[PDB]
Amino acid sequence: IVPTRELENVFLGRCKDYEITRYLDILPRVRSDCSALWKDFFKAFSFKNPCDLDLGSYKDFFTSAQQQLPKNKVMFWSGVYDEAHDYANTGRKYITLEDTLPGYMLNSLVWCGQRANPGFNEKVCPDFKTCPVQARESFWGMASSSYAHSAEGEVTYMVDGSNPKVPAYRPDSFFGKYGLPNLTNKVTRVKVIVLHRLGEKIIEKCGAGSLLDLEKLVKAKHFAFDCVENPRAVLFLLCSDNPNARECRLA
Amino acid sequence: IVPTRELENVFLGRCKDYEITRYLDILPRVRSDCSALWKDFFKAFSFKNPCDLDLGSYKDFFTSAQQQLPKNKVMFWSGVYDEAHDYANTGRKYITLEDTLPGYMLNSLVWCGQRANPGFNEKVCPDFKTCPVQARESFWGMASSSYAHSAEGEVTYMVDGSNPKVPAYRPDSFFGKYGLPNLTNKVTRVKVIVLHRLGEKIIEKCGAGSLLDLEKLVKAKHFAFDCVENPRAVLFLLCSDNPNARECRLA
Ligand SMILES: O=c1c2ncn3c2ncn1[C@@H]1O[C@H](COP(=O)(O)OP(=O)(O)OC[C@H]2O[C@@H]3[C@H](O)[C@@H]2O)[C@@H](O)[C@H]1O
């Protein structure tokens, strides 16, 4: 895979942009300066083989980069990236990891270490499946763990309820591995939103299948639980992109 | 008004982020590097009184920063920032000026010149309703002119049809003054979208009032014209944010 060009410059540019201008009324500023964050980030992977990573590698980076998250507004998602982000609305209705500083800085970027100077590969990175799971997941898994550990109040989790191939909730998804296990007792409720894409056969429903497994796990952690399928506000978002869908017929 | 802190760092950080990572499959990269663009931007206003600007001040900057724009995808808007950008969807449905390099770099920012070193004011800028019209409109007017000049094919214009104080279309808006008059013969059609805010009185409608004045002007330029009020794609986005509104009732 081809890595992001001028990694340090893009990291530092996003970092400065975010610091001064992004999410000002939504998320707090971090204490560390961008240059300090860059040092922590770079030390996690640099001068190592590109697969030489584990869930602890970026611990210091996430420590420095982690913001306090607004109560009741934290959102998680599995399988529905675009809908979840669209609904969250860039921080206005919910927060996603991509609205947080480390999320915003590294969103969509590709990088990897190497042993020789300059300690990272500017030409080429291994396909992600060639490394061990703990290396593949080192960055975004720690990102997701640190974010989950910071959540307070009600959290929302949006899942795909129309994928015949992947359960709406899986123990081995990022939410199952790094999200739910890391929710602290500051969390009070998990609110699940089941997305049924328009025109697709409904596969999973609240109170059944993997969603019932999830309900039981959430209750066992002493969180309250609720679950809704295509609630109106979400249905309207889907309809905006497919207004002639049967489900979108206006009175 | 309070000027943006670290103006140069934010401009350069946004410029570099944009260059390497933003709109890659939507808009072309420009030839000029970010330091060259900064030089052109800064010289437009630096070492002058804060109102000592006119439409030519940022000529070099905008000439350097201008991108070829995607045919049929250019959108203009007046009075409807959030709705226009939500609908345009970060370049996926339409481009807005704020998705172009210069619009992205300076969106939301506040700056102004002073004669004394360092040539710009870090403490306070004029409300600019204080500067003469050519100065107040120097930056965003030239931005609009240059963007309109580059537009090709069908262009879309979203307006507020629910504002009792400000007509949907007026000749002195940025679009009326700098947009429409600068559309070239590469433009084939102006498609107007009139926002009727949910729960609010309708003030303007297609085929009447200022929208009829606009229709006349568009036809006089030998462009085709159409106009729709709350087309369903836009209505459903409004509804997502106010799902109990009467307009949103489903069959
Ligand atoms: O399994 C996921 C995953 N599920 C959910 N997420 C994942 N990120 C990475 N991974 C894996 O690590 C490797 C690397 O991901 P990436 O390309 O950098 O993230 P990407 O750009 O595909 O996705 C980044 C992203 O999507 C969330 C993550 O927390 C975050 O917000 C991928 O191939 C994925 O398999």
UniProtKB/Swiss-Prot annotation, chains A, B:
This is ADP-ribosyl cyclase/cyclic ADP-ribose hydrolase. It catalyses: NAD(+) = cyclic ADP-beta-D-ribose + nicotinamide + H(+); nicotinate + NADP(+) = nicotinate-adenine dinucleotide phosphate + nicotinamide; 2'-phospho-cyclic ADP-ribose + nicotinate = nicotinate-adenine dinucleotide phosphate. One of its GO terms (cellular component) is plasma membrane. Synthesizes cyclic ADP-ribose (cADPR), a second messenger for calcium mobilization from endoplasmic reticulum; ADP-ribose is a minor product. Synthesizes the Ca(2+) mobilizer nicotinate-adenine dinucleotide phosphate from 2'-phospho-cADPR and nicotinic acid as well as from NADP(+) and nicotinic acid; with NADP(+) as substrate preferentially catalyzes NADP(+) hydrolysis rather than NAADP(+) synthesis, about 70-fold better at pH 7.4. Has cADPR hydrolase activity at very high enzyme concentrations, which is probably not physiological. Belongs to the ADP-ribosyl cyclase family. Pfam families: Rib_hydrolayse. PANTHER family: ADP-RIBOSYL CYCLASE, ADP-RIBOSYL CYCLASE_CYCLIC ADP-RIBOSE HYDROLASE. It comes from the Eukaryota. GO terms for molecular function: NAD+ nucleosidase activity, cyclic ADP-ribose generating; phosphorus-oxygen lyase activity; transferase activity. CDD domains: Rib_hydrolase. InterPro entries: ADP-ribosyl_cyclase. It comes from Aplysia californica. Its EC number is 3.2.2.-, 2.4.99.20. Optimum pH for NAADP(+) production is 5.0 from either 2'-phospho-cyclic ADP-ribose or NADP(+), activity is much higher at pH 5.0 than 7.4. Its main location: cytoplasm. Gene3D superfamilies: ADP Ribosyl Cyclase, Chain A, domain 1, NAD(P)-binding Rossmann-like Domain.
